[PDB]
Amino acid sequence: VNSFSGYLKLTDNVYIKNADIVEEAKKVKPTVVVNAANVYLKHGGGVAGALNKATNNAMQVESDDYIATNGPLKVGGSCVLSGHNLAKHCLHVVGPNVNKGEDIQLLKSAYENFNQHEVLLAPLLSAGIFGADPIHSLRVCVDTVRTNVYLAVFDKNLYDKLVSSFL
Ligand SMILES: C[C@@H](O)CNc1cc(N2CC3(CCC3)[C@@](F)(C(=O)O)C2)ncn1
């Protein structure tokens, strides 16, 4: 038993809700919140901009030190950093950004990072400003992640569409 409330169950291990991942995180304080990161951990907009703002920019400060030490992530890769006031940990995961021409097949590799964590609160990778089809992203999530994933979908309209088209 865990504290996630109001999710629709899609599969044995994947759950979905219409929620602001930021407000979902502040209430649940999950062990892991997933950020829709880029390789530079520049958290300017989309989910990343919203998460970072909710930490009062502490996420960005920590991220800049991480990059200064380690260099950029790989597309399809991830790193674990602090969850600040939102979660114990933040798993920064880089899905491909279609608006940069990145290969969509890397979306599966991105979701594989979730399997290193028993339970996660997460957005749909490569959705929103990353330019991928959220329905494809949901399919890859279901077909790749084996651990327990609670997906927060900000837009009520897309949420309804994802549920209604889910196979
Ligand atoms: C209130 C909002 O500002 C932040 N709260 C969100 C956003 C979100 N999206 C997902 C997405 C990141 C990968 C696709 C995104 F960038 C996009 O849909 O463009 C933003 N998902 C959950 N909560």
Side-chain angles (χ1 to χ4, degrees), residues 103-138:
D103 166 25
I104 192 60
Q105 301 295 138
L106 288 170
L107 186 54
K108 188 171 182 78
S109 300
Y111 276 117
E112 288 171 341
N113 296 287
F114 289 25
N115 289 322
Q116 300 293 318
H117 305 276
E118 286 194 358
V119 185
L120 316 87
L121 169 60
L124 284 170
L125 297 180
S126 296
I129 67 175
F130 280 63
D133 176 3
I135 299 179
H136 175 66
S137 180
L138 179 55

Side-chain angles (χ1 to χ4, degrees), residues 8 10 16 135 138 156-167:
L8 174 69
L10 294 177
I16 194 165
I135 299 179
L138 179 55
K156 173 57 161 156
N157 189 297
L158 173 60
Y159 172 84
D160 288 342
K161 180 198 192 113
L162 285 170
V163 167
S164 292
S165 60
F166 184 68
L167 224 196

Side-chain angles (χ1 to χ4, degrees), residues 35-52:
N35 181 31
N38 58 55
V39 297
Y40 306 111
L41 303 178
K42 288 173 60 107
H43 309 302
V47 168
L51 289 171
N52 176 59

Side-chain angles (χ1 to χ4, degrees), residues 5 16 18 33 63 73 82 89 96 99 139 165:
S5 178
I16 194 165
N18 174 215
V33 67
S63 293
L73 296 181
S82 181
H89 302 107
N99 306 316
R139 185 75 257 165
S165 60

Side-chain angles (χ1 to χ4, degrees), residues 35-44 48-49 52 57 59-68 70-74 77-81 90-94 100:
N35 181 31
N38 58 55
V39 297
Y40 306 111
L41 303 178
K42 288 173 60 107
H43 309 302
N52 176 59
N57 211 51
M59 178 180 283
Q60 190 65 68
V61 170
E62 179 195 30
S63 293
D64 289 349
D65 170 85
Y66 173 91
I67 297 286
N70 300 108
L73 296 181
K74 301 170 178 181
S78 69
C79 67
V80 179
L81 289 174
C90 181
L91 180 71
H92 295 272
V93 180
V94 184
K100 302 172 175 179

